[PDB]
Amino acid sequence: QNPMRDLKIEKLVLNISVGESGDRLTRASKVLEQLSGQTPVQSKARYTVRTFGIRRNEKIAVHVTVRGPKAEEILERGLKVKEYQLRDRNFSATGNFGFGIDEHIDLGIKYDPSIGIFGMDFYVVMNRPGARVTRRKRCKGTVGNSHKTTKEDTVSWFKQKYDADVLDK
């Protein structure tokens, strides 16, 4: 069937994985701020690596989750950079999909040598209405298969609106 198992984007999560803390990071953060409007969250390393030059709890990366029309304006905006082609991987079995771009300048955004050039991970997670079942406090349940988000359902979703290509086999 189909009445209101639409395919709304649950949220968009931009991720900048820097190998390091300090100045370089706090600038990568600035990028996600002025790009999201929201004020971005930092992530500490989970263990030391020494060949990645990182210590446990260092503040290694920043990222931000954006929802509602705001997310569309950006997905679209990077989808552009990615010339509207993704790949049959890229889409998870549980529905969602993501991509990256080197150089954030390719989505509006000027240059300015006070900031530099950063890479960015785009991760789009999808769902339908009645999602709140899994997420709310009382009577926390689980969405039925006839309503869970699949791979096919999202690729064809994606293939339709945007009019973008999927590719590979």
Partner 1 sequence: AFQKDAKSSAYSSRFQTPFRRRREGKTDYYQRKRLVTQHKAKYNTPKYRLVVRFTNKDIICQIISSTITGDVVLAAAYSHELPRYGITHGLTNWAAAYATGLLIARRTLQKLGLDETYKGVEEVEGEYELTEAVEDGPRPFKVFLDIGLQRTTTGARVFGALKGASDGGLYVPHSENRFPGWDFETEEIDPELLRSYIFGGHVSQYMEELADDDEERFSELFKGYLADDIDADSLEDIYTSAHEAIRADPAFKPTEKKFTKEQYAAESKKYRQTKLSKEERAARVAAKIAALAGQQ
Partner RNA sequence: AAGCUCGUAUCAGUUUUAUGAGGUAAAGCGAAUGAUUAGAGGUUCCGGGGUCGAAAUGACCUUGACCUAUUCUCAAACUUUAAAUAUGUAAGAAGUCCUUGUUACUUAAUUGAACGUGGACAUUUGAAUGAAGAGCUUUUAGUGGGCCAUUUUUGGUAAGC
Partner RNA sequence: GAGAACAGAAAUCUCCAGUAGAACAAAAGGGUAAAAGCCCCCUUGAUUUUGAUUUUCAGUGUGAAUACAAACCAUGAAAGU
Partner RNA sequence: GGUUGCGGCCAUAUCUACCAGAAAGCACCGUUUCCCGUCCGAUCAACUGUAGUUAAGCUGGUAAGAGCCUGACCGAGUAGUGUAGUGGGUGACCAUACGCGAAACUCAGGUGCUGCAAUCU
How far apart, in whole angstroms, are the C-alpha atoms of residue 5 and residue 163?
A: 21
What is the per-residue binding string for RNA in 121-160, x denoting contact by CB under 7 A?
xxx-x--xxxxxxxxxxxxxxxxxxxx-------------
Q: Rounded to the nearest whole angstrom, what is the least distance from the CB of residue 163 to RNA in the complex?
A: 21
CB of 156 to RNA, least distance (A): 16
Q: How far is the CB of 16 from partner 1 (least distance, A)?
A: 31
Residue of 1, 69, 83, 93 interacting with partner 1 (CB under 8 A): 93
**Would you count residue 137 as binding partner 1 (CB under 8 A)?**
yes
Is residue 83 at the binding interface for RNA, with CB under 7 A as the rule? no
Residue matched to tokens 């953060």 = 29
**H helix intervals, the chain:** 23-36, 70-81, 132-135, 151-159
- Residue 117's SS3 state is coil
Please give the Cα distance from 89 to 113 (Å, whole number): 35
